[PDB]
Structure formats: structure tokens, C-alpha cells
Amino acid sequence: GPVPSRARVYTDVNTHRPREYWDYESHVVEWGNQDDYQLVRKLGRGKYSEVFEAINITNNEKVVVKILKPVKKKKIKREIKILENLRGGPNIITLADIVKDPVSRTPALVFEHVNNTDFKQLYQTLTDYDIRFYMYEILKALDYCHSMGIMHRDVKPHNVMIDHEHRKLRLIDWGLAEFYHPGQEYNVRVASRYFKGPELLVDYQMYDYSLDMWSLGCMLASMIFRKEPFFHGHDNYDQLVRIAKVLGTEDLYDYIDKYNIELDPRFNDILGRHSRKRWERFVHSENQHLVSPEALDFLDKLLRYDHQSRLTAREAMEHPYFYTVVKDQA
Numbered sequence: 001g002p003v004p005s006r007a008r009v010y011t012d013v014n015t016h017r018p019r020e021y022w023d024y025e026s027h028v029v030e031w032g033n034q035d036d037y038q039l040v041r042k043l044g045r046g047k048y049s050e051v052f053e054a055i056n057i058t059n060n061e062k063v064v065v066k067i068l069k070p071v072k073k074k075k076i077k078r079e080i081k082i083l084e085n086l087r088g089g090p091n092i093i094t095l096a097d098i099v100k101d102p103v104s105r106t107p108a109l110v111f112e113h114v115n116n117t118d119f120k121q122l123y124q125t126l127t128d129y130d131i132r133f134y135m136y137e138i139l140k141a142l143d144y145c146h147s148m149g150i151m152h153r154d155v156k157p158h159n160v161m162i163d164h165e166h167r168k169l170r171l172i173d174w175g176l177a178e179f180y181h182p183g184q185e186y187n188v189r190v191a192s193r194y195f196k197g198p199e200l201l202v203d204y205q206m207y208d209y210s211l212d213m214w215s216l217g218c219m220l221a222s223m224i225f226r227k228e229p230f231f232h233g234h235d236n237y238d239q240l241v242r243i244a245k246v247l248g249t250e251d252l253y254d255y256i257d258k259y260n261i262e263l264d265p266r267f268n269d270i271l272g273r274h275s276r277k278r279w280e281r282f283v284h285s286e287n288q289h290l291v292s293p294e295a296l297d298f299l300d301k302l303l304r305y306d307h308q309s310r311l312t313a314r315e316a317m318e319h320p321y322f323y324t325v326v327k328d329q330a
């Protein structure tokens with residue numbers, strides 16, 4: 001069978017916590033009344049939820065209600081417990097309240113509101129400084145939650161609210177977030193297709209926070225090369241191929257060989273053989289202002305097959321790519 005792997009940071013946080021911290025299946029939820037809040041309009045639907053603008057009739061303030069599509073009680077407890085545990089954390093969305101309609105009796109979560117900025121204006125006049133700035137904000141969220149023994153597992157653009165006016169970022173949707181436990185084997189059917197780490201794509205279940213670090217690499221990559229998405233795969237299988245055409249096959253097969261992964265027979269014929277491309281092949285006229293030897297160097301240290309060699313959030317935060325935002329924050 002496959003070789004075991006431990007997270008090399010925050011490995012044992014959860015063990016040293018009281019059982020209540022992570023035993024969310026026994027968390028007892030106290031359901032307020034959904035009539036505290038009046039739905040105003042629908043802000044977008046999803047597979048797991050639908051989200052509405054609402055106002056809280058008591059203090060008259062704008063809020064957001066995420067009405068959860070039917071899923072196992074425990075998956076709801078999980079997301080609540082994780083939100084409860086991470087509250088006040090840098091750039092984590094704030095759970096305000098938890099309610100349940102009186103008639104339909106359907107659970108919902110009430111979140112703080114974020115004056116989100118249109119991505120059409122946030123993907124043309126976004127400067128190389130703004131990309132380093134907000135990326136550093138995401139690492140604040142990632143390093144906090146990882147330090148709190150939590151992996152997010154759905155890092156993707158649609159989950160990062162930015163209030164460009166106030167220069168505020170919030171990491172949202174913890175529906176997929178889970179607790180890290182050394183040795184645990186996890187469901188690899190997680191995150192969105194363009195931000196799956198190779199470990200999900202090859203079915204290696206003993207992964208850790210390093211998964212969140214790949215998804216970040218995908219996003220930085222797509223922003224400095226102005227290619228959305230950067231790895232554009234048709235399915236989960238072709239996604240690995242699109243990755244292999246860029247990182248090379250030789251590292252991929254070493255990764256498989258090192259963890260003694262058993263690769264799918266489907267993959268036995270589509271991966272082929274590909275060299276590792278230098279990042280210079282992706283820089284052109286329109287995007288050269290966002291590319292630099294520091295971004296490239298930081299990017300290359302995030303996108304790695306081997307999850308153990310990916311930078312931790314705290315290492316990322318110390319990378320020279322962020323030297324200016326660190327200095328300006330003082």
C-alpha cells in the first residue's frame with residue numbers, strides 16, 4: 001500500500017486540544033429564528049446552498065443568509081463548528097448567526113456582508129502591487145486557519161471576496177473545510193476541478209494543509225499570466241494531463257513512485273511524456289508587467305506535485321515577493 005505522510009507544520013495542533021474542538025459530530029447547535037432576517041434578493045446559487053442578501057430587522061444592518069441545500073446534519077455541524085472555531089481570525093468571514101425557517105424548518109447560516117468588487121474591473125486595472133497585497137492577505141487567512149488545525153479545501157477565486165475600496169479581503173465558503181489529523185485519509189473528491197492538487201487527481205488520501213497551497217498557486221498563476229484558468233482541464237483526468245504538460249512527467253512519476261501511489265489504468269495512456277517547461281513560455285506583452293523573477297520564483301515553489309515540498313503559508317509570507325507589502329504594513 002501507499003506510503004504515509006504527515007503535515008510538516010501544525011501536525012499535532014488538534015490532538016492537544018479539548019475533544020470538543022474537533023469532535024464536531026457532537027456539537028449541539030442552538031437554532032435562532034429565521035424571522036430575525038428579511039430576505040432582500042438572491043446573490044447566487046450553488047450545489048450546496050443558495051445565498052441571499054437579507055437585512056436584520058433588529059439593528060437594520062445588511063447581512064447575508066446562506067440557505068443550505070439538504071446535506072447530512074453532520075456536514076452542517078462541521079461547517080458551523082469550523083466557523084465558530086475560526087472566528088475573529090484575520091480575513092476569515094464572520095459567522096453572525098445560525099437560524100432555521102419556522103415553516104420549511106431548513107437550516108441556514110447568517111454571515112457578515114462584504115461590499116464585493118466586480119471582477120470585470122478587478123482584472124484589468126489590477127497592479128503588480130495589488131496582486132502581492134491581496135495574495136499576502138490570503139496567506140494571513142490560510143496560515144491562521146492551518147495553525148488552528150483546519151484545512152479549507154476549496155480555495156478558488158469565487159471564494160475570495162475583495163472590497164477594493166476599503167482594501168479588505170475575506171476567505172469564504174467553509175462547506176468543504178475539515179480538521180487535520182495526522183494519519184487520517186480524506187475524500188479526494190473535493191475543491192473545484194481547476195484547483196485540485198495532484199494528490200486529489202491521483203487519489204492520495206493522506207493529504208494536509210499543503211493542498212490549500214496548491215490552489216493558491218493556481219490562482220497566482222492565473223493572475224500574473226492573465227490566463228483563466230491556468231490549468232484548463234476537461235475532466236479530473238485531463239486536468240492531471242494539463243498539469244503534466246507544464247510541470248513535466250518526470251517529477252509526476254517520481255511523486256507517484258515515492259509515495260507508492262497506484263495510478264489509475266485510465267492515466268496509463270494519456271499522460272505520455274512531457275518536459276518541464278520554463279515559466280518564460282507563458283509571459284507575453286499584455287502580462288509582462290505582472291511577471292518578475294520574484295513572482296516566478298515564489299510561484300514555482302507553490303506548484304509542486306509533492307505536497308511536502310510546497311511552501312507553507314508561513315514560508316510564503318516570508319518570500320521576497322512580499323517584501324514591499326511587509327514594509328508598507330509598518
Ligand SMILES: O=C(O)c1ccc2c(c1)nc(NCCCCCCCCNCc1ccc(-c3ccccc3)c(Cl)c1)c1ccncc12
Pocket residue numbers: 043044051064066093111112113114115116119122130131132133134135156157158159160161162172173174219220223
Ligand atoms: O459560503 C460562505 O461562507 C459565504 C459567506 C459570505 C458571503 C457568501 C458566501 N456569498 C456572497 N455572494 C454570493 C455569490 C458569490 C460572490 C462571488 C465572489 C467572487 C470574488 N472573487 C474575485 C477575485 C478577484 C481578485 C482576486 C485576486 C486578488 C489579488 C491577487 C490574486 C487574486 C481573487 Cl483571488 C478573486 C456574499 C455577498 C456579500 N457578503 C457576503 C457573502
